Symmetry: C3
Subunit: 335 residues, 3 copies
C-alpha cells in the first residue's frame, strides 16, 4: 500500500541530460513526485528556417526523462496552461491500466491533474500524449519522452554480473510531416490548429519530410555535441514513439544493448546497429576506448544525412594504436 510510503520530489532536466539519480540503491520503494507543463509552440526544425507547429512536454522534444526504480510509484502532476489551445493527457507505457493513464489525465487548457501508478517493470518506456481522435498528430508534433525504471540492484549482464554507466544521455527521434504548398516550399502556419489538415495528409503518405534528433536538424552537433572521455561508460537512451529507427555509433559499438528496452531481459553484446521499434525506447551502453568525434545516427543513411537523424559525441583522451593505426597515410599509387 502506497499511501504509507516515503515521498520524494524530483527536479527534471532538459534533454539530452538526464536528472541526477542512483543506479543500484539501498533505498526501499517511494512515491516519486514529478511535474510537467505542456507547451505548444512553433519551432524551427532545420537550417533553412522551416517551422513546425509543435507540441511539447516541458518545452523540449523529447520531453524530459523521468527516472525511478522498480517498485517505486510514479506520481505525475500534468499541467496544461491556459495559453495552450488543445487538450492533452499522458499514456505511460511503463504503467498498467486506463490506456496508460490517458483516461485519467485528460486536461483542457487551464487544467491539471495528478496520476499515480506503480513502476513494477524495469526498462526504458515511452510516454506520450494520446487525446481521443488526435493521437498521431500530438505524437508526431513532439509529445513524447522516456520513463526509465531501473532495477533496484542496477543493471545486469547475461550472467548477472553488474553493469553501470558513468553518464546518461537521452535521444528522442521524431519523424516529422511538414506540408508543402503549390510552389514546393514548406508551409508556415500562424496557429497550431491551422497546420492540422495539411499535416494529416502528409502523415498518411508515411513519408517524413524530416527525421530529427531532439527537435531539430543538428540539435546534437557543434556546440551541442554530447561529450565523453576514454574510459567512461555512456548510456544512450533512444526513444521513437511513432516509427522504427536503427541506432549506430560510427567508430563504436553497442557494448551491451537492450534494443526492446526492458532490463529484466539479458542484453546483447557487440552490436554495430540496434533496432528501436516505433512506440518504444531502447538503451545502449558503450565504454569509450578512442578519442575523437563519433557520429551517433539512424543507419538508414538517407534518414540520417538527408533527413536529419544524426548527432555527434566528442570524446577526450589518449589514442590507442593497438585498436587502430594508420599504417600508411594516403599517398600516390606506386610506379
Amino acid at each position: 500500500d502506497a499511501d504509507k510510503l516515503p515521498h520524494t520530489k524530483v527536479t527534471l532536466v532538459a534533454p539530452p541530460q538526464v536528472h541526477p539519480h542512483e543506479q543500484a540503491t539501498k533505498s526501499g520503494p517511494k512515491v516519486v513526485e514529478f511535474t510537467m507543463t505542456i507547451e505548444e509552440k512553433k519551432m524551427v526544425i532545420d537550417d533553412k528556417g522551416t517551422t513546425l507547429q509543435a507540441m511539447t512536454f516541458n518545452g523540449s522534444m523529447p520531453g524530459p526523462t523521468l527516472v525511478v526504480h522498480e517498485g517505486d510509484y510514479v506520481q505525475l502532476t500534468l499541467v496544461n496552461p491556459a495559453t495552450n489551445a488543445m487538450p492533452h493527457n499522458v499514456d505511460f507505457h511503463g504503467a498498467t491500466g486506463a490506456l496508460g493513464g490517458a483516461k485519467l489525465t485528460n486536461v483542457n487548457p487551464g487544467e491539471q491533474a495528478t496520476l499515480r501508478f506503480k513502476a513494477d517493470r524495469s526498462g526504458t518506456f515511452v510516454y506520450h500524449c494520446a487525446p481521443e481522435g488526435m493521437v498521431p498528430w500530438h505524437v508526431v508534433s513532439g509529445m513524447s519522452g522516456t520513463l526509465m525504471v531501473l532495477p533496484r540492484d542496477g543493471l545486469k549482464d547475461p550472467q548477472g554480473k553488474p553493469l553501470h554507466y558513468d553518464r546518461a544521455y537521452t535521444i528522442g527521434e521524431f519523424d516529422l510531416y511538414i506540408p508543402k504548398g503549390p510552389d514546393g516550399k514548406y508551409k508556415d502556419y500562424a496557429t497550431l490548429a491551422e497546420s492540422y489538415g495539411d499535416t494529416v495528409q502528409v502523415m498518411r503518405t508515411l513519408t517524413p519530410s524530416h527525421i530529427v534528433f531532439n527537435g531539430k536538424v543538428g540539435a546534437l552537433t557543434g556546440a551541442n555535441a554530447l561529450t565523453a572521455k576514454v574510459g567512461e561508460t555512456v548510456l544512450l537512451i533512444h526513444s521513437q514513439a511513432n516509427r522504427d529507427t536503427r541506432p549506430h555509433l560510427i567508430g563504436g559499438h553497442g557494448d551491451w544493448v537492450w534494443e526492446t528496452g526492458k532490463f529484466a531481459n539479458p542484453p546483447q553484446r557487440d552490436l554495430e546497429t540496434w533496432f528501436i521499434r516505433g512506440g518504444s525506447a531502447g538503451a545502449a551502453l558503450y565504454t569509450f576506448k578512442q578519442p575523437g568525434v563519433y557520429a551517433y545516427l539512424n543507419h538508414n543513411l538517407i534518414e540520417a544525412f538527408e533527413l536529419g537523424a544524426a548527432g555527434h559525441i566528442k570524446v577526450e583522451g589518449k589514442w590507442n594504436d593497438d585498436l587502430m593505426k594508420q599504417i600508411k597515410a594516403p599517398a600516390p599509387i606506386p610506379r
Copy 2:
C-alpha cells in the same frame, strides 16, 4: 513413419478465435487432418465503402489458425472450387521442402489436393498462397494465416518454468494497396482479374492505402472487440505475411513475447512494443490486471489510427488502486 500413426480431424473456427486445443499434452504424435476451401470475393474494408477484390482461405482474412503439437503431422486438404477464377496453392513456413508445399498443392478452380508434412519445429508460422508469377498479389489480397505448433509439454519461460494461456486470439494484419482513379476516389472492380494491373502499380510504391486487422478497419472494435477478465492470461497471435508491424497493448504489456514466434527460444519479458517481421507470425502472453477497454495496435500511430491497424480488448473485473490511481482529477490550475 507416419503411415502407422493415429489420425484426428480438427474443425477450424473463424478468426479471431482459435479452435479448441490442448497446450501441454500426454498424447503422442498424430496425423492431424484439416480442410480449407479457397474463396475469392469482394470485401468492404473501410467505413466509407471502399472495396477490395480479395482472396481468402476459408472466407476470412486472415485464414483460420491451425493448431498442432511438435512431432505431429499436418495433413491439409486444400479445395479450390470452380466458382473461383484463379489457381492457388499453399506455402507453410512451418514445413520443410517443396517451397513450403506450394509445389505440391497447385490447384486450379474445380481441383483439390492433400499435403502432409511433419510439424517438427515449435512456434507460430505463417502460411500463405504462392502461385508462380503472382505471389505478392495473392498474399496482399488476403491469402495468409497462422500454423501454431505447440511444444508437447506446453510453453516455457527462460528458466524453463511453465507458461500458459487461458484464451487465444489470432490477429492478421494486412497491408492493402487499393488503386485510385483520376478523381482521387478508390476504384471498384467488377472482377478480381480486372483489379490486378492497377494494384500492382500501387504495390510497387510500397505505400499501403489501408492497413487493417482481420480484413477491415474496425474489425476488432465495438461489438467485435476481443474480451477478457482480470486474472486471465490471453495469447495474442499476430501474423503479417508481407510487411513489418509493431504490436502494442495500450495500458498493458507483453508479459512474455516471442516476437520471431519460435517457442524453442526464450521469450522476452515486459515489452511495451514488439516487432513482427513481414513474412512471420509472433505470439505474446499478457495476464490482465485492470479492467477497461484496452487498444491493441500497430505502434506506428499513423498506420494504426489513420490507416486502420488497431483493435480493442474489453476487460471485466475489479479496479486496482495500487497499480494505478487518479490522485487529483482534472481541475483548474491554482490561483
Copy 3:
C-alpha cells in the same frame, strides 16, 4: 602489441563465394593482410536494361567478404585508381575509433592507404565507404560489404555446443534509387557525377526503384543460383548497409540465426523470417533436408518479386516423405 605478430596474406574472392578460411583454429592471433581496389562503373541492374552509375569495392556489389578471427588484426590496403572520379574511404563497423577508419583512409583518385585495426569482437560487420558530405550516395551506389570475425573456437549454440557450416555464401542487398525523366523511363547517365542530383531527389523519397541482391535483379538465379546438397550446412551472410530487410528461405528455416550478427550472443532457432537492420550484417545456418529449388528472399514480397530482392538455391539429394508428402495430387473435386 601487433608489431611483433605473424603476418598472413589473404586472396579475396568474388561474392557470393567467401574466401577459404578455418572456423575453429589452433592458430594464435595474426595480422591478416588484404587489398581492395575501388572501381566506379556503370552497371545494368535489371532485365530491361536500366543502368546504375555504380561505385564498388573490387568490382562487385557487395564488396568481397573479409574473414578473420577474434584477436586478429585486419590490415587493409585501400587503392583508389586514377581512372576513378571520386575520393573514397572505408568505415569498418568491426573497428574501434576514427569513424571506423574512414578518417584515416581518405584516398583521392591515384592514391592509396593502409589501415590496421584489432578485430576484437566476433560477428558479421558491415564495412562501407563514407566520404564527408557524400555518405548515403556512395553507400546506395554499391560501396559496402561484410567483415566476418569468427570466434577462435568457432560458432556456438545457446548451450555452448559447437556449430559449423560446410559452405558459406555472402548476399548483399542494395536498395537503389534510379531517377526517371518526364517520359517515365529510367535515366541513363554518361558519367557518375551527372547522376548525383537526380539520385539524391529519389533518395529523399525513401522509395527504392529496385532492391537487388548482389547488384542485379536475378543475380542469384538460373546459372548463378547458389548450390547445396541434403545434409550440408550452409551459412548465409546477409548485409544491408542502408535499409532494413527480412530474409526468408522458402521451404526452409533459419536453424540457428544471429539476426544482429554478433556471435558472442546466443542464436535463435527455428526462424521462418529474420531481420537485418539497415547498417548491419546478420548470419543464418541451415542444414538442407530436402532436395529442390529453394527461394531465398526478402519477405516483403513486393520488395522481393516486384523490386528484385530474391534469389535461388538449388539443392541435390534424396526426397524425404517423412518431412513432406503429396497425399493426393491435384484432382477434380468429388461428385
